[PDB]
Structures are given as C-alpha cells and as structure tokens.
Amino acid sequence: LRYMSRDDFRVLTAVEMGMKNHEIVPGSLIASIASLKHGGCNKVLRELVKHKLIAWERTKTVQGYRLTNAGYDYLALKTLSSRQVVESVGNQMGVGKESDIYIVANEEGQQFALKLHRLGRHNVSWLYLSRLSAMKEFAYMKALYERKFPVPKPIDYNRHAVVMELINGYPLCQIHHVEDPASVYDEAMELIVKLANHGLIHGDFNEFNLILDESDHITMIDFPQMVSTSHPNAEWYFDRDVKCIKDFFMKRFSYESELFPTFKDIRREDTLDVESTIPPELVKQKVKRQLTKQQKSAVRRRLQKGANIFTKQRRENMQNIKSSL
C-alpha cells in the first residue's frame, strides 16, 4: 500500500527519465535531476528496495538501480491519485497473461476497472513495450465509444494504466446456457458488420474476447491486434470470425443460423483503420536557469566520485599481503 507521499514521487520519476535513455541508472544521476532534496535520497532508495519498487545492479563495472515490474505500476497509480480517479483498492482481480485487471474506487465510491500491462530482452525494453500497448488500446477505446460501439468507457491513461467503465459479467467461453440464443447471435453478427462498416477487422473475434452482461449485452475488450480493410486478405479474416461464431452457437447452444451476413461495405462510416526590450521578469528567469545549470553540473561530478566499490575491493587484498610477509 501507499503510505509515503512526498519524496517517493520525485525519486521514482527520476529513474523513469534514465530508463528511457539507458539500461541501469546510477545513483549519481538520480539526485541531480531530483534537486529538491539533497543528500537524503540514498535512504529513500533503501526503503524502495524493501518493497518491489527498484532493483539493485552491481555486475562488474555497472553500479546503480533499475525499475521493477511492480515499481512501474505504483508510479501510474500515484499519478491517477492526483487526477482524483483512484483512491482505494478493490480486491476482485483477474490475473491474466498479457494484462492484470484491478478494481479501483474514487472519492465518490463508484467502482471502476483498471488495466495494467504486464509484458514479459532486458526488463527496460519490457517496460517500454507496455507503454506503447496502453496508448494504442486507449486510442481504439476512444474511437469506438464515440462511434456507438458497446465498449467500456475510456477515462484516463498513465504510462501503462488504462481506466475503464466497470462492466461486470462472465466471458463467453464459460457460459452454459443463454435464455435467448437467437437475439444474442444477431447482436454479435451485427457488430462484425459494424466494424467492417467503419473499416476494421477484429482478427481474433472469438468466444475468448467477448463478455456477456446479465446474458443480454455483449461487451468487447482487448484491442491491439486490429487491422485495416485495405489489407489483401480482408475478406479472409472477416469470414474466419463469422465461421467462429456460426459454429460456436451450434456447438454450445445448438442454434443453427437463419441469417448469413457476408457484406463488404467500405466505407459508409468513419475510417477508424488510421486510428531595454526584455522585461526584468524574463531576465530573472533566464539568469536563474544559467545559475542552476552551473550548480547541477558541479553536483554531478561530486556524485560521480561515489568509486566507493572500487576502494573496498582494493583494501581487502592489501591486508592479506602485509600479513603474509
């Protein structure tokens, strides 16, 4: 849980700055880009290693710290807390392979769903691929909700976290019986034609990516696999998804289809496949920026002398040599 709520923001963000450019970030660089408090950040790092926030690395010459899987997760929730979306944690968690579903509650008490991308090449690249995944998923989530589609409502995105509307139900793969099989079938078949009208093919439109809300309403999730209709095999991915649903309702619910939708309509809807002159106030700001940069460069060279590990190794052998002589 989150108790510490001051210096932990600045130190962890400073790691993320170094993570985008380099692998393991040395402790010398951290304090320079987090200049608000000086000296006492080294004990904060020792509190960060207690939790699964940062990992230590002392291989051969490389001495420093790298951000963990769970440590990257805490940073997004800390940003979402300032945007007043997340306050307390709900416990109903569906631990998946590509993502983790966490229930979140706001100031109001209204429960929302949170998605956290867990892509698992070094861990630096793995925590960068999760960044691009959430930004792509939120892009489709906004694009479909605006265009009448039955998708969860997009709220906020932070690095890898995506806040969505809480639609609670069961996935189609674990459904025994539906009270009205025909009405549910026609609803699902319409949504494939709907996407094709907007110039989109789902690709993997199966029973594993569909959730029923009280056996009345079909909800769609997971959107990183979507392709354009400009693709040469556009009708192939269209027909494969149709046959997947055609066979499933005949298999599980024993419903044979009377309507066979195979229409190519591109595009009647929006193409979503793309988706003295200088005042003294300014003089003061400019002088300040110059004077801070001169101090920051000097502090970097003071911190680069921390090598402490090199001095410790040299001292051990000297004691052995003098005793043997």
Partner 1 sequence: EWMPVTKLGRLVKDMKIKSLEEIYLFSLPIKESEIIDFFLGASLKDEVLKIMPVQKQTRAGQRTRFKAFVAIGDYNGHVGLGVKCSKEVATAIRGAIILAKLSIVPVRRGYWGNKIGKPHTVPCKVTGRCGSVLVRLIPAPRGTGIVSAPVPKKLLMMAGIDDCYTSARGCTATLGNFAKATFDAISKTYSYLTPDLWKETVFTKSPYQEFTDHLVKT
Partner RNA sequence: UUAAAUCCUUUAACGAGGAUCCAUUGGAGGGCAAGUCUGGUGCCAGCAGCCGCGGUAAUUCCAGCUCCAAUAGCGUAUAUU
Partner RNA sequence: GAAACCAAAGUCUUUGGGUUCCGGGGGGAGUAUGGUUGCAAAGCUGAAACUUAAAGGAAUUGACGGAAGGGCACCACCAGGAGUGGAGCCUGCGGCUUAAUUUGACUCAACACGGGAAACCUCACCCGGCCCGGACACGGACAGGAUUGACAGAUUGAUAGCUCUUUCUCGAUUCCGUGGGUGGUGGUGCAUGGCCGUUCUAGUUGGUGGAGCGAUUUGUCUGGUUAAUUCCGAUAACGAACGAGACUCUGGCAUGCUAACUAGUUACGCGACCGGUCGGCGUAACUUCUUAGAGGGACAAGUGGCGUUCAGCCACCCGAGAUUGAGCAAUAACAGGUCUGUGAUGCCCUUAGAUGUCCGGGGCUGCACGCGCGCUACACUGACUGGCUCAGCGUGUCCUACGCCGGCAGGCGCGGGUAACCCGUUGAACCCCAUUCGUGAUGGGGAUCGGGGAUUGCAAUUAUUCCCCAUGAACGAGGAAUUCCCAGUAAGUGCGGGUCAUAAGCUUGCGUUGAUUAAGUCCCUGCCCUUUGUACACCGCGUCGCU
Binding site membership: which residues?
115
Q: Does 289 bind partner 1 (CB under 8 A)?
A: no
Binding mask 21-60 toward partner 1 (x if CB under 8 A, else -) reads: ---------------------------------------x
Q: Does 61 bind partner 1 (CB under 8 A)?
A: no
CB of 321 to partner 1, least distance (A): 5
Q: Does 259 bind partner 1 (CB under 8 A)?
A: no
Q: Does 278 bind partner 1 (CB under 8 A)?
A: no
Look up 100 and say whether it is catalytic: no
Residue 6 binds which entry of partner 1, RNA, none, CB below 5-8 Å type-dependent: none
Written in H, E and C, the secondary structure of the chain is CCCCCCHHHHHHHHHHHHHCCCCCECHHHHHHHCCCCCCCCHHHHHHHCCCCCEEEEECCCCEEEEECHHHHHHHHHHHHHHCCCCCEEEEEEEECCCEEEEEEECCCCCEEEEEEECCCCCHHHHHHHHHHHHHHHHHHHHHHHCCCCCCCCCCEEECCEEEECCCCCEEHHHCCCCCCHHHHHHHHHHHHHHHHHCCEECCCCCCCCEEEECCCEEEECCCCCCEECCCCCHHHHHHHHHHHHHHHHHHHCCCCCCCCCCCCCCCCCCCCCCCCCCCHHHHHHHHHHHHHHHHHHHHHHHHCCCCHHHHHHHHHHHHHHHHHC
Binding-site residues for ATP sit at 115
Residue 324 binds which entry of RNA, partner 1, none, CB below 5-8 Å type-dependent: partner 1
Residue 321 binds which entry of RNA, partner 1, none, CB below 5-8 Å type-dependent: partner 1
Residue 325 binds which entry of partner 1, RNA, none, CB below 5-8 Å type-dependent: partner 1
Of 7, 100, 186, 204, which is the active-site residue? Answer: 204
Q: Does 308 bind partner 1 (CB under 8 A)?
A: no
Q: Does 268 bind partner 1 (CB under 8 A)?
A: no
CB of 163 to RNA, least distance (A): 22
Which residues does the annotation mark as catalytic? 204
